[model samples]
Target: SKGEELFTGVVPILVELDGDVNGHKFSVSGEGEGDATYGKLTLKFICTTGKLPVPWPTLVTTFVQCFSRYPDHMKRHDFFKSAMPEGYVQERTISFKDDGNYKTRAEVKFEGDTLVNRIELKGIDFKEDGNILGHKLEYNYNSHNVYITADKQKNGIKANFKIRHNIEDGSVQLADHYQQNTPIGDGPVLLPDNHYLSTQSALSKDPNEKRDHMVLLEFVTAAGITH
Candidate 1:
């Protein structure tokens, strides 16, 4: 359709430097050997933002590429050890839903504190919540994302405390205990509220120091790398 318009105006840059989201990248790498990565991230926005003649993938993919990093990290830390190999990767092809702010698919953390790049997760700046029995006799955890090794790389931040022959609860609704001749119900199972054999059945006061998993192999980075 050729209208009477004589010329085309310049395609103005629609982006402003200051947006609601202050562009920032988060990382969980240690000082030396434990230079772990936060899942997989490939920023394509560099090209996308400049706006070339053609448009392309502003993709953000998550993967386990530790063998390529420091071998020691892959050798030591739980995060690196878990992501050792398997061509483990995940991708989001410019994607949506009530999913406004989606998170890492296969994550590994201990409650609010995270243990990546090595050592431990300390200082849980939590608020408050506690019922009674269902939330009773619980212990600290070494939590991880659902996918243990590939299988279905797309995992979740789902929490479920279960045992021997079962697992299927999304509400994080219980803390149970069962030993030899253990009494069990349809959903209730036992094995000590704590999951670690080393810290088996161990419950501590808030200031027990040992209970806080703050083994800093090195130090955490505040995050820097802006163009």
Candidate 2:
């Protein structure tokens, strides 16, 4: 397949974001040219790991107007407890410890929402991701059993609880985290020694374990599947 003189081009049209619910939407109406036919194509991308051009304040205002009928409590509860298109509730907690370890735990509560369910998210360390949306992920890379526990309760119980992702996840894993290892005097070969630019291992050990929740929640597609 090498040096077969394969060439192609993509004519990307204007993309629009109709709405946002913890994700960004872009409608792509583009055409490709190659041996393969790309007749009248339409593609959509629901981005989880990218920034939007709109100002943060404007984005917040838009969401507030969209959910105006729902009170603040309702907004919080419904958004967090809402089920994905595949009919699954996405709940996850990530944690990073001082011992150079990370763990991510995810679960969905089933039934009996009126009883006070004790939700305790544990890890070797507590940190935040410093985003406007405040939800924490539990991850302990070096240790085992890093997770969030939702005790089963009686009655139909709804919740308005969140781990401080802004404080706990942001403090440790921001995109712009500054770090230096061998000093900046290493000339043009000064490689990045970022402290926050670490990696997370896959969480899927069993195919039937239903790692689909990760993709449903915009967490991960293949449970640590690399690019």
Candidate 3:
């Protein structure tokens, strides 16, 4: 009872981010090299944002303005861009309910299709002695959004989200972690993802080290596709 995974869901059709399975693009290399090549395409994405619902990813409004500075973040940006249709539809909503309980609803449309990307999430945040820079905040909110992203090339999809921890100074800390049998939950845990096998460092540090505390996020993308 101490360490048990409790959930009810479908066995997500896990798929690798290899080249397209529908067909091959380039010829394989020498013998024993297999049929895959280096030209086709395989996209792997990771979305980072402090705000819940990720603010309904957009090209000009969000992705471009946010991710231009970070290089590692640009990949996820590019991946989502190429995967999503131009002028795609996306929306997000958060509701603060009774007893410190909250819920989030999100939806998005891929590229030019009528199909919708949707997810329903519920969570709560508790006050803690979380430290940042050198000041202590009054309270922080911990909430997570469960959403999905599509990989048309591989006919694959990923249902995931980022966990956000907000401080009173408006300085937010974000950690990206996935659900794992070794119990990997993202939040103000002061650790990164893949904690089961390794350890994660602090969410972030004061860029200036002079202010009380501060945090910002920029999800980068390239040519509407992540490398």
Candidate 4:
């Protein structure tokens, strides 16, 4: 384990997405390769929306390509919600709460379904990796959460969502976000310079507190404010 000359070649990753949302059929196939460190070396991505207007075409297409280069080896559909470009819209609002807490609201829509999430921030800290340079958003569904991380690459912007988990057990599972896109931004947005009210410290303090509806709402709302 000390001085072992370990050499490996290609790691194959196959990603497929197929489903119907509000009568709109869509699918995507992605193949990628990498080495031991899992840095993607090559990617092939193809997506199809059967005779329906593709929502947020630019955002969705770029994600499919970028995610192919760095897919979640542990989950195949990490890129599904990030790749599908249909029935997606989002709006954000900011104001003050009765307690003087910085209140934020994010309205998210996908496939004719809509959800509103809110959060309050109080002297929180938010940070991002230098490599993860792009506009991003999160949608907290009842039992699951959807994230969109995007960065500008070459001629366009690349964005994709991370793997979804079971709110009850943190188990990796299938989630239907009905992947679609909306033109949000080419890079990170400007928000208040604080972490979040319900920080990791808040969530980490409790082992049984699931990132359920309200918890996720708080986290997402804080993210919108901080990002």
Candidate 5:
């Protein structure tokens, strides 16, 4: 059991960022576990000052997108061989957990000699515990008021939350919430929700599809922390 996985099949990370522009401090962090390919990729956002150079709302949205999508993409790097120009892709498959079952194939794309983009992700089925009643989650990005659904096995418990964003000011809120369609074993409580506003600062979007997932993708990806 020297090299056994503690969990299996698409471990998920909880993405969280909270702070204040007026206070000049903030934090970005992700916590999750993987079979062996990723093994506990905990990440924290780092900057020189408490004041972020960009708007906080933008930072949260963009980072969550990449944090949600990249791991599995990274595991399938070979898929980009044709899309990426010849001599511009550097890729390799490595086993960090075990053998092929939990291996990751990573690819770094380049334009001429300059790096262009990078993709990495290991699974589907978004998940979070404690909050949202410890149910497994599925995320959708294409629509407004995105719905996140959670389900629990055995007890057959389910919860749903909707997130809506204002594209103009970058303000976001938990627009709606619900839980346990039928019934469960305990008293019920409404989900705690929060209001968020943009700090007004901004970062220009990147052209690379991977970086497009988040404005801070390049920095975070290079940092190699899952957060």
Candidate 6:
């Protein structure tokens, strides 16, 4: 509630990602005392599986691997469609996905409210066990929430980049992007300016609209004072 008290201690940090698909989303968040400048982001990847373990998932995943391998006469046929049947999209969105957790940390610095420096992250590399085909699906992803004045606006009292975060897959990883040696500058800003960065605002449950794919970084500063 007080200003000085707010800047002195650590707060919880959360980074979440959402996929536009019916049952796809990611969430990562955590913190520690005295670990004000550093926090381990545990990313959880979640997506829908089949109601019935049919062979279609395997076939779909295989064909998608190299769709060009198929002959060209199959345009009219809806060769690629969601395995989720009607009403199931709403069902899976509520709860599900397998063994979904990947974690890592990064150093962060904030000049009052603006995230002053680039928070470069260690890539979280992982691979799923099986495949629709004999596939070893692997993903290597990185996240870095650099400083950006995305919108010249304010949320309550937050003046600058408080609403800005990183281009992320999750606390886990998305698709293997690139090696982390060479740094990408203040490029590809996540959470566009004017985007309300609240949990409810970003989340979607209504059939009218499931939010577009996006990422979020939220912190509860001054709440991290540990004994």
- lDDT of each model, Cα atoms only? 0.19, 0.20, 0.23, 0.24, 0.26, 0.19
What is the C-alpha lDDT profile of model 2 across 117-215, one tens digit per residue?
A: 112122232223323233432322111111111222311112221122223334542211111111112112111111111112222122453311111
Candidate 5 lDDT score at position 203: 30
lDDT of 4 at 211: 23
lDDT of 1 by residue, 36-63 (tens): 3322111111221232111111011121
What TM-score does candidate 6 reach? 0.21
Per-residue lDDT of candidate 6, residues 16-52 (tens digit)? 2222121222232212122222221111212232121
What are the clash counts of all predictions, listed in order? 4, 31, 12, 8, 15, 3
Q: How well does candidate 2 score on lDDT at residue 196?
A: 14
Cα RMSDs, all models: 22.9, 22.8, 19.7, 22.0, 20.6, 21.7
lDDT string, candidate 4, 15-44, tens digits: 344433223345544444433223223434
List where candidate 6 sits over 4 angstroms from the true fold. Answer: 1-19, 22-35, 43-138, 143-145, 153-227
* Model 2 misplaced stretches (Cα beyond 4 Å): 1-77, 84-98, 113-227
Residue 71 in model 2: shift from native, Å?
2.5
Candidate 1: pairs in clash: 40-63, 177-190, 178-190, 178-191
- Tell me how far the alpha carbon of residue 91 in candidate 1 is from the true structure, in angstroms, after superposition: 15
Residue 2 of model 4, lDDT score: 10
TM-score per candidate, in order? 0.19, 0.17, 0.23, 0.23, 0.20, 0.21
What is candidate 1's CA lDDT for residue 64? 19
**Best model per lDDT:** 5
- Model 6 accuracy (lDDT, Cα): 0.19
| Angstrom error at residue 89, model 3 | 11
Looking at model 5, residue 194 earns an lDDT score of: 21
* TM-score-best of 4 and 5: 4
- lDDT value for model 2: 0.20
